[PDB]
Amino acid sequence: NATNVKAMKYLIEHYFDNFKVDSIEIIGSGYDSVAYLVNNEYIFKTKFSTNKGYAKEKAIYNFLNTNLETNVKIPNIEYSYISDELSILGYKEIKGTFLTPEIYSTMSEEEQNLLKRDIASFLRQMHGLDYTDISECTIDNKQNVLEEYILLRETIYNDLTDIEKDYIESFMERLNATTVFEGKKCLCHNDFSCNHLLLDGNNRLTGIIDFGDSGIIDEYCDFIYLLEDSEEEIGTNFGEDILRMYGNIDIEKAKEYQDIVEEYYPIETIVYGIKNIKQEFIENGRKEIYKRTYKD
Ligand SMILES: Nc1nc2c(ncn2[C@@H]2O[C@H](COP(=O)(O)OP(=O)(O)NP(=O)(O)O)[C@@H](O)[C@H]2O)c(=O)[nH]1
Ligand SMILES: [Cl-]
Ligand SMILES: [Mg+2]
Ligand SMILES: [Mg+2]
């Protein structure tokens, strides 16, 4: 605990010549990464070598801070160090409160509507950017899945159970029949969940973070979490209304897209385990297949 922060304090002061760390605490973490609040003022996202890295994320912030017109704040990178083994991005903390189901349920109907409009407006503005200058950041989700399926076939597929194989083949049958990858491509946040959305003191959208998965990809991508029915997200109705306010988009296919990504999740989890040599993820994905198969 107190040892991570010393190591990171050292790396920050070593790589950014004039920077002095008066305070530093862990503010969040993924499975590959750790984030730190420094001097009660700066966020520092960090990562050590992992199927990389923070170069794309930086190029995305730089593209967006040049091209977006919006009052919604996003990270603006002041400090970056990027190497094969280590990557650090520092920027000023955007202040606010993260959106949650609980907060949402306390908002008046009109407060909720204004938030949904704020979100639809943000997404419309980003999805509308001429992305020529960030064109290297393309992502083909369908092709990625095919390549991941090939990796499964080359590694553990033959040891899976019949129930597990059927789940996967049935997913691939669905992938092959769907049309939801054939639509408009644009620059998407691509991890647009309510834990990345910041509210100000009037419960209006004041900022957005973590454009780490951003790319030129299906327009439907940015509604996947807004449409999710779970304890972490607000609800299907929230995403529906946002889709209506956003306009010019096939809502039923947005939902199909979301449903297909949800079906893929256990396989994604297995694949992450294969690629990063973590048996624990392989087993969680496989077990999740049994859970889904037996649910009614
Ligand atoms: N309030 C605030 N919190 C921030 C800001 N930047 C990051 N955070 C906090 O730090 C956490 C992690 O930041 P995030 O960019 O989501 O990183 P990640 O998923 O954990 N890393 P990765 O993008 O490499 O997978 C966020 O959940 C949030 O608590 C910011 O500008 N303001
Ligand atoms: Cl296993
Ligand atoms: Mg995040
Ligand atoms: Mg992230």
**How far does residue 19's CA lie from ligand 1's centre (Å)?**
21
130 given a catalytic annotation: no
Residue 205 CB-density burial (10 A; 0-12 exposed, 13-18 middle, 19+ buried): buried
- Looking at the fold, whether 133 and 169 belong to one and the same domain comes out as yes
User: Which atom belonging to ligand 1 lies closest to the Cα atom of 212?
Assistant: 23
- Looking at the fold, whether 274 and 177 belong to one and the same domain comes out as yes
**How far does residue 50's CA lie from ligand 4's centre (Å)?**
14
- Looking at the fold, whether 87 and 115 belong to one and the same domain comes out as no
- Looking at the fold, whether 201 and 146 belong to one and the same domain comes out as yes
Residue among 213, 136, 143 nearest 176 (CA): 143
Nearby residues for ligand 4 (ion, Cβ within 5 Å): 210, 212
Q: Which two tokens stand for residue 195?
A: 């834990």
Distance CA 224, CA 236 (A): 10
Return the SS3 of 64: helix
- Looking at the fold, whether 86 and 108 belong to one and the same domain comes out as no
Separation of first and last alpha carbons in the chain = 42
Would you give the distance in Å from CA 222 to the centre of its chain? 9
Q: Which helix (H) or strand (E) holds 289?
A: helix 279-294
Taking the CA atoms of 285, 292, 235 and 252 in sequence, report the sign of the dihedral they define. Answer: positive
Number of domains making up the chain:
2
- Looking at the fold, whether 169 and 68 belong to one and the same domain comes out as no
- Looking at the fold, whether 48 and 158 belong to one and the same domain comes out as no
Distance CA 38, CA 264 (A): 37
Q: What is the CATH number of the domain that holds 154?
A: 3.90.1200.10
- Residue 253, CA distances (Å) to 20, 118, 146, 180, 220 in order: 50, 23, 21, 6, 8
Residues with CB under 6 A from ligand 1: 27-30, 33, 35, 43, 45, 47, 75, 93-94, 195, 209-210, 212
Distance CA 114, CA 124 (A): 15
DSSP state of 189: -
Substitution candidate for ligand 1 out of 73, 210, 272 with most atoms within 8 A of CB = 210
The residue from 43, 63, 92 where one domain ends is: 92
Task: Answer yes or no: is 210 a known binding residue.
Answer: yes
Taking the CA atoms of 45, 50, 55 and 56 in sequence, report the sign of the dihedral they define. Answer: negative
Which ligand has an atom closest to residue 33 CA?
A: 1
- Look up residue 10 and give its amino acid: Y
Please compute Rg for the chain using Cα positions.
20
Q: Are 4 and 26 in contact (CB under 8 A)?
A: yes
From 32, 140, 191, 259, the catalytic residue: 191
User: Which atom belonging to ligand 1 lies closest to the Cα atom of 93?
Assistant: 31
If you take atom 5 of ligand 1, which residue's CA is the nearest one? 93
Distance CA 60, CA 62 (A): 5
Residue 204 CB-density burial (10 A; 0-12 exposed, 13-18 middle, 19+ buried): middle
b/e string for 65-77 if b means 16 or more Cβ within 10 A? eeeeeeebbbbeb
- Looking at the fold, whether 116 and 212 belong to one and the same domain comes out as yes
Return the SS3 of 204: coil
Report the alpha-carbon angle 99-103-106, nearest 5.
Answer: 145
Which ligand has an atom closest to residue 282 CA?
A: 2
Which ligand has an atom closest to residue 88 CA?
A: 1
- Looking at the fold, whether 41 and 102 belong to one and the same domain comes out as no
Give the determination technique: X-ray
Distance CA 12, CA 222 (A): 33
Residues forming a β-bridge with 221? none
Would you give the distance in Å from CA 127 to the centre of its chain? 16
The residue from 69, 92, 115 where one domain ends is: 92
- Looking at the fold, whether 192 and 124 belong to one and the same domain comes out as yes
Residue among 259, 140, 143, 135 nearest 187 (CA): 135
User: Which atom belonging to ligand 1 lies closest to the Cα atom of 207?
Assistant: 31
Distance CA 26, CA 261 (A): 31
Distance CA 115, CA 251 (A): 19
Residue among 217, 147, 136, 148 nearest 182 (CA): 217
CB atoms within 10 A of CB 12: 22
Distance CA 98, CA 104 (A): 10
The residue from 36, 60, 92 where one domain ends is: 92
Domain that holds residue 145: 96-296
Would you give the distance in Å from CA 34 to the centre of its chain? 15
Q: Are 283 and 266 in contact (CB under 8 A)?
A: no
Q: Are 23 and 12 in contact (CB under 8 A)?
A: no
Q: Which two tokens stand for residue 89?
A: 């991005």
Pure H helices in 54-202: 54-67, 101-106, 109-127, 141-154, 162-177
- Looking at the fold, whether 191 and 263 belong to one and the same domain comes out as yes
Residue among 43, 13, 45, 41 nearest 29 (CA): 45
**How far does residue 289's CA lie from ligand 2's centre (Å)?**
12
CB atoms within 10 A of CB 126: 24
* 97-98 sheet: strands from edge to edge: 97-98, 197-199, 205-208
Distance CA 10, CA 15 (A): 9
Distance CA 244, CA 248 (A): 8
Q: What is the CATH number of the domain that holds 30?
A: 3.30.200.20
- Looking at the fold, whether 84 and 112 belong to one and the same domain comes out as no
**How far does residue 157's CA lie from ligand 4's centre (Å)?**
29
Q: Are 27 and 41 in contact (CB under 8 A)?
A: no
Distance CA 199, CA 206 (A): 5
Q: Which helix (H) or strand (E) holds 82?
A: strand 77-82
The reported resolution of this PDB entry, expressed in Å, is 2.4
**How far does residue 156's CA lie from ligand 2's centre (Å)?**
9
Distance CA 174, CA 178 (A): 6
Return the SS3 of 142: helix
